[PDB]
RNA sequence: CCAAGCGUUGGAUUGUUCACCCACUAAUAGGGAACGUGAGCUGGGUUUAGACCGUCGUGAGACAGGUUAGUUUUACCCUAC
RNA sequence: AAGCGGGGCCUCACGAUCCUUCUGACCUUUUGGGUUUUAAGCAGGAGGUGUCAGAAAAGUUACCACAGGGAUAACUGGCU
RNA sequence: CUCCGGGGACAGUGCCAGGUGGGGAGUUUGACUGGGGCGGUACACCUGUCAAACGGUAACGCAGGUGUCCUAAGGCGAGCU
RNA sequence: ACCUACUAUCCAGCGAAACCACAGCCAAGGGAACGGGCUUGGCGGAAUCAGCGGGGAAAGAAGACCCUGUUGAGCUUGACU
RNA sequence: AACUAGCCCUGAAAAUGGAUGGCGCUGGAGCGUCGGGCCCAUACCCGGCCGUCGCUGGCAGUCGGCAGAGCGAGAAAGAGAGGGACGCUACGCCGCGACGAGUAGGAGGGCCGCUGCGGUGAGCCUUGAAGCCUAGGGCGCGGGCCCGGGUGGAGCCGCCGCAGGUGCAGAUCUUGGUGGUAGUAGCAAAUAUUCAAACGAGAACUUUGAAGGCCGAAGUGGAGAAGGGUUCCAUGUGAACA
RNA sequence: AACUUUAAAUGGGUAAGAAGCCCGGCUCGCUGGUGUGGAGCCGGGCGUGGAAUGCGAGUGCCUAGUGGGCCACUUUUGGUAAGCAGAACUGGCGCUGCGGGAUGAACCGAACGCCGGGUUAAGGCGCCCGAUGCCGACGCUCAUCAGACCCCAGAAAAGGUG
RNA sequence: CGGUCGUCCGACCUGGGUAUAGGGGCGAAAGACUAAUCGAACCAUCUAGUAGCUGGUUCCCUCCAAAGUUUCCCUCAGGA
RNA sequence: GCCACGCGUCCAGCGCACGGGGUCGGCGGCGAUGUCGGCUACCCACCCGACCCGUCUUGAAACACGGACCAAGGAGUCUAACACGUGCGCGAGUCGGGGGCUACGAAAGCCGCCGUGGCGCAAUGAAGGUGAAGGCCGGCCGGCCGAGGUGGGAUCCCGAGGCAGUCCGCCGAGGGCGCACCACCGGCCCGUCUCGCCCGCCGCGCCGGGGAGGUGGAGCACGAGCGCACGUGUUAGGACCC
RNA sequence: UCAGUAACGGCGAGUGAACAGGGAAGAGCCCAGCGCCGAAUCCCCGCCCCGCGGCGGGGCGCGGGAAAUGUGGCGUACGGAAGACCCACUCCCCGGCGCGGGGGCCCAAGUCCUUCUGAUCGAGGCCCAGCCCGUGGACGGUGUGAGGCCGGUAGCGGCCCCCGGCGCGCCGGGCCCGGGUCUUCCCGGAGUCGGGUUGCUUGGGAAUGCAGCCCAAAGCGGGUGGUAAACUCCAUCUAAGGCUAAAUACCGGCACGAGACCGAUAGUCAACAAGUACCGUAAGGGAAAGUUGAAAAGAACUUUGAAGAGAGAGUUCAAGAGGGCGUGAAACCGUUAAGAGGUAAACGGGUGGGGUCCGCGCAGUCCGCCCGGAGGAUUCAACCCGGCGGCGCGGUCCGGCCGUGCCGGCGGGGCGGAUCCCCGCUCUCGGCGGGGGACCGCCCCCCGGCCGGCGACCGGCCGCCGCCGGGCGCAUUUCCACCGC
């Protein structure tokens, strides 16, 4: 909508919203990110700290497929299986703990961020955290490694 | 000239990009052209399936995808040899064959042989000439029931196996997953040094004895 | 002291302003008007491009240092007379 | 001994990125795995930008050119 | 059995390496400045003043100093003036 | 100072161009520091013709003299590559 | 006699004619100290109108024979029970107070304007569309708009949304057209034309005769090359050029 | 001014309560003659809301233009001086019209929606030019260069038996 | 263009053909000539080259409303 | 002159009006071919005011630059990226944009076993890697309570009271749960520094890890993003135009 | 998509891939060499037969030639060749003949009545078929606006030709073919890889890739495994030979369709005798320029002038459309009317005067309520009948329907579930995929019991009210017309 833009209200105004002393010239400060070690030093330090310099090790042929290790917290652990299995787990008097295969839903590591409900589980995952294991053992569950 | 707060941007427009601009107004017309050639191909091979030859069951590389199963380029020669199908005859009956594929596993080798067994049962083969039906062709009543198959023939569905809720034993209860993961991390890291340490340690025992 | 009414020259030299000299004269006073006055005149000198000499710079070149030759356009418009 | 001292009684005598060099480790990577050189990393010093918040930099144009500037000179007019 | 002679495994050619190379190519020749240039740094610091009794406060304002030096001219303790 | 030819003068015919914020009488004052317009005064009368060069800071060309530009070119070298 | 303080004079001289602003003023219309009265700027007070801001004010209570006409009241709380005007597009209407400058710049509202698209007006229209002109009637603060008259002959507009190549006084702007200058500058380099006749509507310039002149054989003569390309010849014309 | 025993005016900080006092008790690995000291936690009791005046406050994003200034009282630097250059406080012009000073960027008064009435500011009231055409008061002054209103537009030492 | 001028038997003038083409030619040498263009000819393209530098930047009303000051930048006509 | 009208016991209607902003229940004339009215827009006269616009500038009417006049055209546009704000749909999810199936229709609808993949849902460290509360009781184990606290906090809850005697609702000293958000003190995750006590396995050490106190992080501590559209601002692009 | 990522970069400006995954498409193969077959191979010329606009095939050549300095068949890394033993069909393919696309011609219904116009395609009507056709109401032309005037459009509509095709049949034909087990053999591309150096390039960083020079290979070998090197395990292919459609691109060309695009200073430079006129020696530069009227019906004829040009007359609806002619603005000029005129002109505020047309003003308002009297009606209220509507707390009448309500189920279905016997296959029992069944949850239906509603959504009876229509009622009721100033 060009009718809703600013240029429709600027008709009849000489400087077109750009001033009379500092005319809207072509490139007063330089094109692009010019002047990092120069006249644009303060903006590059007060808003982008760490822009200039090298740090860390180079890695020539990096494949993002190798580093794929998605994580899941203990908050949304019971959301992986359906709600029907959660009701029957506490309802069952034999103590048959349902199995939640973390790799099946698309995660590899389990992190112990959240609280677990007091009913046993069997957790199959590719990796585990230290705190995630003690929370599972605290309820009376088992951590099963799988590859 | 940057403003107060914002990003540092690198627009890749410093070349003469306006000459090499690819518009996509052909896309609605391209879709009709893809559909019309696909429908015309299907009528040319009217008894044969529109998808084409069957594809093998394929596990993925790149461990990110290693739990997924796709449809592959073609069946391996080891998979055809077990199924009892000659490699030069399978291509005429709609079996994708490539000699590049390997067979490192037995489960995937047996899965494709089992996939080939159910394809041979479902295959209705017409005789070379209608006057003289040969030995390996389908029955006469199967000629009248031959129909085109829409979509991928025998689609490969990544099926998951259910498991029943078990009672946790004491071995699973007392297992230390984090400790085992940390221990296997160290021994893989320290495999070479311990092997090297035990190597020259024998020659300090030999020199001590002699 | 009143007094600008009326006058304040011809020439050698130098582009000269200035300056000096010769002679006459009543006297040969000082100045302004975009340091009056180039669509009124001249282009002698400053102050282009060509050159010569002296000094300086390795050099291209520089010199309120000299010498030489170097296009001076237009009123028929308005006002003023 | 209470105490004082992590420089000079105080107000001044000094230097970013990148690169190089040295030192510190029972430290990380060197790529499919293992060993050893080497190389790349972490941290702490040094090698300097004196135009000192830090380009690598000789002139001439009277053969000169462009965008401009009465923000800035040579002339008249103004103030003293 | 080389057309005659004259040179000849040297000229000479290809690729590298070193020297030389305004013949030629590209580029540079800081800033402040009572115009610019020249001279200076008022371009990085410190002291007193300007500075008008909190602080801050300009000019190529005034008077000066600095890019160090110290195995002690550092740190305690003791004794003297 | 006088004479001649062609103009310039007028008429028969044919007939542009530059330039043009609006247009044009002055004294003093102030103003962006030399006004045709503003202030206070002097004053002012149709339409014109032939000259005329005092004024319109007259017309000609975004000053070439000076300075700035992180704009260039010709040339030189002990500038850099 | 010596000081001292007021008004006035000398000190006190620049160039176009000249400025307490001018005229002029001297029982001031000058100077110093002071009175009443009078003059008036968008300044202040009162009153009318417009807009903005705030009260983050009030209005669904239009509660009518199923009724009762109220919440202007200084005082934490209850008119509690055992046949009838307007209104209210609530993005609307109404009441109080205060305020209103403006460059650069920012924001909001446009039932301001142009073009095309989707809807919509049982829209306008050869008994006259668009466009243009207008000494008329008007509206809106304004951008602009509606009628009246003339010309015109074939399309056009209102509202809700959508979209843009959407608004000019300038840029020594571009294209095109027209003025003052102006019936003006000018039609002045190389000695010179005159008379008669013919023709024609029309004769200084055409044709013929005569006279007077010039080029003076290195020509204003007679033929070439390059170049031009029908300019060479006859007839006719005076539309355009000379 | 680069001296100071003294030493102002103007000025610069802080306080004028409820987040303040007064009690009682826990904790501490801090400090230790000593529940010594300090800090933090709690629980309880005190409201005449503890100077005047005025005013609704607090807070988060995005953000144009600006980064050549100038003038005026007072102070002050350099310069003989400048409508010169450079500073301090405040106000103006820039950005702003109106009345007055003959005119005027900065002066005086006063800031602005469109009007009617009234009244003023600064200035004025012989004519231009609205207003003294007051029975205006008291004195001074004669110029053959009189004088006449901030800014401000011109004058000195000296002299006069005017 | 006029008058006045230098030379006019030899380094004289001139026609046609031909050769040298742009960082090149050619120059009894003036930075001169190279199709009215020469301190680097003309045509087309890159190219709508860049400009911290001039000029311009199009309808109405209402409301609010400035700054030429700090620090840094080969920064001083500009930016953060 | 009076904003004073009754008894005993105890210590209401009628009129008038300095009254919540003007009415007359008051009048006089002239109006058919020469009279009335018509703000504005046509022309002319007078008084007052009044220098030609744009632009650069501290300063313009300038003897600072563009500008004879008129008509048309004529300059912040489009793509991509980002930030913020707003509107819409879904929501710890969100999205087909690429691909298939069914004149306007090149539209529209459908396909999540076409969500591959983009963003978010976890960060930290150069990296190896690691990766987000505890307390009590009983004897390192077994049970319990189980998601931090303080102050300020819009709103909501109770009722000492008060609008012979109950219910509704009112308000109310005082007492609380406290939304969002702010300040502070704590707690947890990763790297780094310092200090220790230790335990333990599938291969008992130069091993693996825990603890306590500082410190760095763009972290956690009961989500908030995704997709589309709009506006502003900064950029790369020819980039408001010459 | 990875991804503006790894990475490159005075690590500054900036530059910047690849793997994997999801899709479109999907087709594999042939040599040299190793070897076996008696050169078993191929070209040309002559003859026969048959088609001959692609000279094609087959047969004959003591016809010529190529080829042993290597043609053809088997055979290519997935292995291949030879021999022995089983199994198996022997039928594939060339040159001939006869049995939908392109083009052409046509297909529905008003010029029907009245009325305007210069002309209608403008307006009204065509009742009971609200004219007629419509699988045809896109477009264009016809004297403004047309579905039916016409060309067209729709149609799996009709008719007539050309093209090879798909398969059948006949013959000229080549055609005796392979797969599994065992045994014996064989097997690979050289100034090439690789290394050094230099230059260019790349994200490729102690050279990613390409190229010049020099060195220059090997066969349990060689290359790659994103940091230079040595040792050792592995992983993955077989380079230095070649062919191959599809997804893909397309500002040139051929033929099309379409547009929220522009409308003669716009849009291609060019809507027109446009790359034309014209300019430059040349390379090249490069315009301006659309519109009478429906139909020329383009002004016959008379008269002045030598004619250009006029004045009459005539055409047209209109010459106020008269040949560069539709509409004809402004700058500018000419003429008519009015006004005015010594401080250049012009402007703002306030009046005044004169014109211009307008108000169609010139006797100045009507509207309601009441009174008077003149009139004129088929006329009022109240009853009866019929219809319609509203409301009802009918205190709760009866019945339907629904639930963005709940409950129940000797219930049923359709599903879903990460809740728990049978069919088939790779090693009768143990493992695996699929289909039950049961259970749970959701939806729908049979119902039944409450709650709510019919005011986002209801009908019948009863009561009340209102309205309309028809009978009476009939004039002191009611309704029309006239005036008082």
UniProtKB/Swiss-Prot annotation, chain A:
Molecular function, one GO term: structural constituent of ribosome
Pfam family, one: Ribosomal_L27A
Phosphoserine: residues bearing it: 67
Native source organism of the sequence: Oryctolagus cuniculus (Rabbit)
Name of encoding gene: RPL27A
GO cellular component: cytosolic large ribosomal subunit
Protein name, entry field: Large ribosomal subunit protein uL15
Sequence similarity: Belongs to the universal ribosomal protein uL15 family.
Residue span of region Disordered: 1-36
């Amino acid at each position: 909508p060009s009718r809703l833009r600013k240029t429709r209200k600027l008709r009849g105004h000489v400087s077109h919203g750009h001033g009379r002393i500092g005319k809207h010239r072509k490139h007063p400060g330089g094109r692009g990110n010019a002047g990092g070690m120069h006249h644009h030093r303060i903006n590059f330090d007060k808003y982008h700290p760490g822009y200039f310099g090298k740090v860390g090790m180079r890695h020539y042929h990096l494949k993002r497929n190798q580093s794929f290790c998605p994580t899941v917290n203990l908050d949304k652990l019971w959301t992986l299986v359906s709600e029907q299995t959660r009701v029957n787990a506490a309802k069952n008097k034999t103590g048959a703990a349902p199995i939640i295969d973390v790799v099946r839903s698309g995660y590899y590591k389990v992190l112990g961020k959240g609280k677990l409900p007091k009913q046993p589980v069997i957790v199959k995952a590719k990796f585990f955290s230290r705190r995630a294991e003690e929370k599972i053992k605290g309820v009376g569950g088992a951590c099963v490694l799988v590859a | 000239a940057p403003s107060r707060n914002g990003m540092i941007l690198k627009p890749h427009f410093h070349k003469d990009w306006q000459r090499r601009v690819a518009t996509w107004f052909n896309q609605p017309a391209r879709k009709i052209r893809r559909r019309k050639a696909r429908q015309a191909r299907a009528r040319r091979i009217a008894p044969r399936p529109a998808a084409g030859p069957i594809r093998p069951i394929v596990r993925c590389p790149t461990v990110r995808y290693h739990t997924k199963v796709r449809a592959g380029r073609g069946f391996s020669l080891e998979e055809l040899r077990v199924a009892g199908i000659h490699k030069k005859v399978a291509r005429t009956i709609g079996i994708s064959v490539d000699p590049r594929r390997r067979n490192k596993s037995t489960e995937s080798l047996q899965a494709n042989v089992q996939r080939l067994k159910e394809y041979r049962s479902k295959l209705v083969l017409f005789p070379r000439k209608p006057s003289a039906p040969k030995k390996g062709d389908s029955s006469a009543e199967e000629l009248k029931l031959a129909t085109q198959l829409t979509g991928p023939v025998m689609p490969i569905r990544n099926v998951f196996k259910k498991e029943k809720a078990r009672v946790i034993t004491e071995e699973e209860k007392n297992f230390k997953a984090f400790a085992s993961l940390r221990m296997a991390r160290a021994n893989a890291r320290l495999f070479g040094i311990r092997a090297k340490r035990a190597k020259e340690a024998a020659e300090q025992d030999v020199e001590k004895k002699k």
